[PDB]
Amino acid sequence: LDKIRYESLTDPSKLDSGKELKIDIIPNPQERTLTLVDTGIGMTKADLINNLGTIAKSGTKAFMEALQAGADISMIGQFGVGFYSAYLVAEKVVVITKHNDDEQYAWESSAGGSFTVRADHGEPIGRGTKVILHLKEDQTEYLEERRVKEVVKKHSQFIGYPITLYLEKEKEKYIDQEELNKTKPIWTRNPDDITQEEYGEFYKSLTNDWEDHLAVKHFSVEGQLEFRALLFIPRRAPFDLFENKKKKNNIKLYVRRVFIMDSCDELIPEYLNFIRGVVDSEDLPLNISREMLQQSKILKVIRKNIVKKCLELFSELAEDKENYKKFYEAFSKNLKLGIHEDSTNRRRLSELLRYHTSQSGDEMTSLSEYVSRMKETQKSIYYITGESKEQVANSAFVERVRKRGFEVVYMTEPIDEYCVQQLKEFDGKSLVSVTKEGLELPEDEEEKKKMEESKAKFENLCKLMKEILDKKVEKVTISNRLVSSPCCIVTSTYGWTANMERIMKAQALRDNSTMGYMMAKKHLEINPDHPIVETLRQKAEADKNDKAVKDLVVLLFETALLSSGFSLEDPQTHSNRIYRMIKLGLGIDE
Amino acid sequence: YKKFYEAFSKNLKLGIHEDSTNRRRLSELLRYHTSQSGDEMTSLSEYVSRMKETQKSIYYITGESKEQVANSAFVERVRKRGFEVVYMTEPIDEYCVQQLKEFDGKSLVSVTKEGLELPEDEEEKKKMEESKAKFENLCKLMKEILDKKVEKVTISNRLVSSPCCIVTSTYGWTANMERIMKAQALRDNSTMGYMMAKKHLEINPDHPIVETLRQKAEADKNDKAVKDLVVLLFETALLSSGFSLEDPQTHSNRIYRMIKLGLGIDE
Amino acid sequence: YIDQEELNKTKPIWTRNPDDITQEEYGEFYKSLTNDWEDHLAVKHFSVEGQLEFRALLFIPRRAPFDLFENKKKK
Amino acid sequence: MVDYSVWDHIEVSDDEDETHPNIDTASLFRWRHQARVERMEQFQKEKEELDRGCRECKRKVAECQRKLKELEVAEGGKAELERLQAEAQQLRKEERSWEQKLEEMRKKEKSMPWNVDTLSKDGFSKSMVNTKPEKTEEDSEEVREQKHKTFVEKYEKQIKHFGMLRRWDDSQKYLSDNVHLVCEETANYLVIWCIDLEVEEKCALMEQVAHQTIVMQFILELAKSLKVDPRACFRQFFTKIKTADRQYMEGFNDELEAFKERVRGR
Amino acid sequence: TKPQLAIVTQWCEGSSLYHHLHIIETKFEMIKLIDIARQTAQGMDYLHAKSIIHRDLKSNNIFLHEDLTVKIGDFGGSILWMAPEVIRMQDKNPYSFQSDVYAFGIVLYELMTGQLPYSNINNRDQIIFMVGRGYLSPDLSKVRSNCPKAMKRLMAECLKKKRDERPLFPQILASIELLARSLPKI
């Protein structure tokens, strides 16, 4: 069809018999025929012999070479052994052909060692070629409607010509259902004339969607490797986004508008699988069966480009602070997952993160804004990871830092610990948690001297607490992060924190022989301002070892363990102690 | 077999989940602990050859650690008669149990759900029916005071030495399942949050505390002490059942105030 | 000059009759198929002499590898 | 013909299919990138040395031509001329050797191959934001009335065409284009149609149409529970009903029987 | 009514070797130490064949991952583990493969013995001044009671005087494998 179309644009006289350009498919489940009438250029006897009767020979290459140098011509096919594939499902093949300046001829073959070509009389065909197939016995599935529809949809849907069918539905009429392809390609045309709504209509007919898109990128490179792309971003994350199993069919790959292969385990990484698009190209080192690309390294190169462009769009999407809340409330996990495992481009991916902070009510801020409003002597950021919004709001660690007008960030999500474990510094500043072996903050010398005196002030109960509790807490020290709570518990530098333990222990598929090595020891911090510690000092000084002192110490440690995010191993003893106190306070002797 | 089971136990428990034609011949290879063997893994086939004639179903518990399950409030009555229960302490057991529901034409019922019955004489059943009327006003009183945090607060027989315990509904995730599903990453929690975790409440008419509360509440309806008592009981029972508190700070402050009251600081 | 015929030394066991092999030979074959410092735990050796012909040999490692529950490792 | 000899050398630094069980990647990618950059800069230093040497040599050749022209009128310089000629000849032959090395080194870069920033260069790029007003909901009563009349008439003809069947995948595509088109009004008219079918007492048609109807209104109930339109939630229920479990199947049958009893008494 | 399917994890960082052999005891058997030595030798031998120089392989770079799998890294009192030719300040390129061999020998010696080299004198300036103009190396007497003899010979060959007589990595790998498949107890 393309050959005759190009040849027409010198003298209209070649179109005196048949002006329309069309392709038809006529199924017939009575003589098992699958006629494929078209209206191409046609063949002559000699050309019929040297093209259809010579393995490994193509006329398309000769026609392309013989035509000047440079034209509006892009045909598909240079190998030559492509038509004999019709013998995969066939028993007898007939081709009826006519050229403009010859007579109608018929070619009959049976996949043996000979073919019969003869002049024939019958139905006048204008200038096209009929290809009649007599199907086999056990492959009588391709005469059904749904199979043909699916096979045409999957492979050849962007051919720029009207493929039609002449099925028989319900007099029984003669239907001309033309909906085989009615979505013209849109990435070929210029980018200055397409007006939004066309992009939306193309997207709605691409992947089965009832809505419109949110962004579009339409770039193209040039040189030796040249392609065009139409990357998209959707509105709502599909519910089975992380269900995997099913082969991914979000980014395709075309060469001259013919499907070749689809995958996104090499074209884009695993944390950018919510993007649809088309990566159409022109020429590539294809395989003998056009389903694979030799020199797979090429694909990796393509990946680079796409990733870069994608990241650019994200930054641009941050220019307006109204759609970013919609995009960040549905695709937040992917950014952190990418930050976890990506060594090349992570600094740029660390600027799109949005966090709650303790100066803004319900409006998320960024890290750059946090760097903006720091104090003169402040060094490093302060962060804390928890299980809920309000559980972390009022805790024991924050109450001193927030009292001095500093700032602390909140992270309430499971993946946030994974993100923090990798990212260790931002813009020349460190990230330090508020729950790790006595973080140091700037202070006056007088308060330092007062703390030095207080360290010796409570030097005895500190050591007396040690032998009461056997191997459990490593050691107890005086700490300064509390103002209205008696005691707290922190972890150590080299090991898991509380939330890390909670997330790991609840994992389904992992071993159990690595627990002991990596879990960190726990330290106990006592506040030298609550009167309870004062009364404990009085009791410990007065008496060396009393039952009440032991009971108070155990109850205090247990409550501190409860309030610091840890999990208790024997809650029944705690409940029994509470019940004992409740009966001691409400009458009944025993 | 011990060495093979110690290392490759997890792959078998995925077969009962993902496969549907080999469950019958694969369910035999599972081996758990039990309430009669100290350190020795028994099996379901050996277990079914030890139950009494009157018993009709298999009883199981899904916990977090062996020691924590060993003295739980749920298995306090079913172990008194002499019955046997099997311990399941791993997330993969929770994932596999939801599919395996039958064995030798017998049903599996947990000890942490609603509607658990022990086939026994009608004497104690009549006694509990009689006692079901003496604790009727307290039902509606506590239903009102708890303020749409629990759905039903009735009386039943599952405890002998604990004033309260909490159980979930018949159709819905249990406590350990809820904890596991909340903990993991890649939740896509825009959906699961407002669907699950239905709960009920349980009491017993034997402890001095409940009888004292009833005798106090019959006299006064709007007293301030009953609110504090019911709140503290709900918090403690909710704690000692595998759940997690919404805000530990309030409970910690209550405990500290209680100790301060007990050691004389006042104000 | 050097004579390194060690390009192959391990003979194919799975073509022999099942009852003519000892445990030591099975262990030695398992040694030079996956680099390990332990022997096996159980071995199965059968065949299907039906319309389709195939014979298999399947082992069971003593100790599990660390990365057997990953995402996309080359199985 | 068909010469693919040009795509026979490509280098990529961050290859995810070339590792060793004793190297943690991460650092290996940095090593490869740094080595490639260092080699690139070494060759660039050599090439720029050669290029600026050739440029200054051409300038000196022009200067020597000027000197020869001025010596066509003057005289006296012979030893300097001989030394300059010998030095220029040696320099020219060594620069010819270096130029041979240069077009060999280009093929050497064809051996140590292409990189990411040599195969292609950027062209054009545009991007939109689509700041559409995503708030379009008409008045409840007016849309109910108009959809009822027109939409219900047309898609009630369609539902009368569909209802005589009992196929699932056919019902799958029918509900696919329905959720493309239909809304709650069509479902309500399906409910009233099932009511009048109950009135008409057609047992087998009752069974089939009731199967389809309970499927659709269970979709509706899930829609109400999730507060999401049935336009958006059809595929997951379809894929869980075609692969339904035996317990799910018996629960579905119990619900079917309960609904049939409810309608029979209605 | 739409159950779930169990989801696997991604990975987790293991404990470093410096922490294992300087902060905790963590004593293993001889076979495990030989296996770790063979694994790190194999990793260095692979990195050996593409002209990539590790340029330093401090102990904290070495990772003991889950189960037993050694992994080498580049992430980063360290004046002890550069070659005696590193101290020079001439030509700004005294580095070659023998330096990596020497540092591998240092790692091997520490792995066999379990104590820091040069434990007698603790003075960084004194240590560097003595090493830059001396020939003093850690004594070979401090070895495990049941250590093999060929391993001692290999350690003696690890660093003799100069960057010309050091052995290449494939020889070390072959010798390590030969000793590995010869050692029931001794």
Ligand SMILES: Nc1ncnc2c1ncn2[C@@H]1O[C@H](COP(=O)(O)OP(=O)(O)OP(=O)(O)O)[C@@H](O)[C@H]1O
């Ligand atoms: N319907 C047709 N009308 C006219 N010529 C046809 C028709 N079908 C095939 N041909 C001719 O067949 C020859 C090529 O046949 P064949 O399909 O085997 O080779 P190919 O074009 O290299 O392969 P393909 O394009 O399928 O990859 C050409 O001369 C072409 O003109």
